[model samples]
Target: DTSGTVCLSALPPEATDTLNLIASDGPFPYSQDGVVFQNRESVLPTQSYGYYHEYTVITPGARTRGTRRIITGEATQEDYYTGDHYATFSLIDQTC
Candidate 1:
């Protein structure tokens, strides 16, 4: 139930910032940044409601939130990136 593993370094710099915020549980910049993400498409491993949450990776001067997101699974302590609007995903390996 995984596409593959994406290295932490491979992510865009904005995504790195998003990850840092997630770690610190910061006041997420956007109101929707730390909201539950219902896995309606089932691209990720099926899990309970609220098991998955999403954070937006800020895009440079975009009028709205960008296409990228970091989806976290608290139960498994796993992170996934959905660069394609939650249609596809891969586990995030935060270290080499």
Candidate 2:
């Protein structure tokens, strides 16, 4: 019944720019396992948080959180796309 946007606590400010990019385009780079990397749109683009958006998976699933705009600013709550709670990722800045 909960298929919508979720508020994040705090995320990296840089994520906003990334999200802005995706919002204008489509999905981003994908992991080796086929995890599509992108931001969570204020409106559900096609999926919600990682997996099905409306459901959860039984195994480990972690997708890089895009970015969420909070009352303070962007990157309020970073989300890992998965329900296993053990999924992990490392946001790398290729230019830095």
Candidate 3:
């Protein structure tokens, strides 16, 4: 979800708060995969950051027994200009 982080970085400070919450408006379209969510609160220009959420799919369901799909990626810096107000949630499959 690097694109999500890019979206967050482009937000103006005035709208960052509202934009942050909107990311969760819908369930991620994929069922089993890794997802990362970055927001102004979680990223800071100061580089003294806080929480960084790394969402992961738990044990694949029975249907995934022979799927040719894998989802995940490397992490990179998420840039934003904010301090003292950032939060993150790393959601996993309920069974986990």
Candidate 4:
């Protein structure tokens, strides 16, 4: 049930901002921005433990870190997105 996909331009501005931050290598708003993604929910394809890293996508008006996130792999240069925390994910088609 997890084989979904999303267009880069269709994502929220905060999600795009996270992507830009990933490219520029800087100043993430959350302390957990660059932590290893354990893929504990098993929504993503199986990979080694440290293959993915996660960043937050700030939700407008939320006082704390929201559920939205952008998960990436350095060597693949590919990214995944989750708007409902780790409950589900979509392969991001980076055509933005």
Candidate 5:
């Protein structure tokens, strides 16, 4: 379970959409969108390897993919969002 909560509405619209796509197992925008997030930075709480999967968050008006990301747990069903390329993270609480 997540240690904290984040309102879905508080995040960027693109992030929310990305989260939906993840929940639906959908046609992600980039080939790298559904790739495994190594969590090399170790900013988020520790878990078994491969427990975390990552998706991309599109940034407005950028030629290349932006640094924003949405990370979800494989077993916990908790989602964490990082706007600064994994430098920081916020737990997503949909009920909020």
Candidate 6:
């Protein structure tokens, strides 16, 4: 379900900001950024508990966590982006 892909370059600036924060192991801007992401939608590849974490992307003017988010897996650069909440996801292809 989440086999679709996204190139890092195609993501918005806010998404890029979140990506860098993940690299630094932040100081994430949101209190919920590093929490475990339970794949309730069952769209992503199944894995053990603690296999994924979710981060919020600033929506410029929105007060909510917003629809855009970055999902990080338990491996190097195994990242995913959801521009429409969890309804759809695109794996971030860093090699692009």
Instruction: Give the Cα lDDT of each candidate.
Output: 0.86, 0.30, 0.28, 0.85, 0.82, 0.89
Winner by TM-score: 6
Candidate 2 lDDT over 1-96, as tens digits, reads: 113333321334334444444445434333222243343443223433443111122122435432222111123233332222323322222232
Task: List the candidate 3 regions with Cα displacement exceeding 4 Å.
Answer: 1-22, 25-46, 62-96
- The weakest ten consecutive residues by lDDT in model 4 span 73-82
Model 5 residue runs over 4 Å out of place are: 1-4
Candidate 3 lDDT by residue in tens digits, 3-81: 2232433433423332233245325324332234334442222222223332222223534322221121123333222
Ranking by lDDT: 6, 1, 4, 5, 2, 3
lDDT of 6 by residue, 1-92 (tens): 78588788888889889988988999988899999999977889998888999999889999889999999999887999998888888999
All candidates: CA RMSD in angstroms?
Answer: 1.3, 12.1, 14.9, 1.4, 2.3, 1.1
Residue 57 error for model 2, in Å? 24
Tell me the TM-score of model 4: 0.90
Evaluate residue 90 in candidate 5 and report its C-alpha lDDT on the 0 to 100 scale: 84
Candidate order, TM-score descending = 6, 1, 4, 5, 2, 3
Judged by whole-model lDDT over C-alpha atoms, candidate 4 comes out at 0.85
Off by over 4 Å in 4: none
Candidate 5 positional error at 75, Å = 3.4
The pairs that clash in candidate 5 are none
Give the Cα-based TM-score of candidate 1 against the true structure. Answer: 0.91
lDDT of 4 at 42: 76
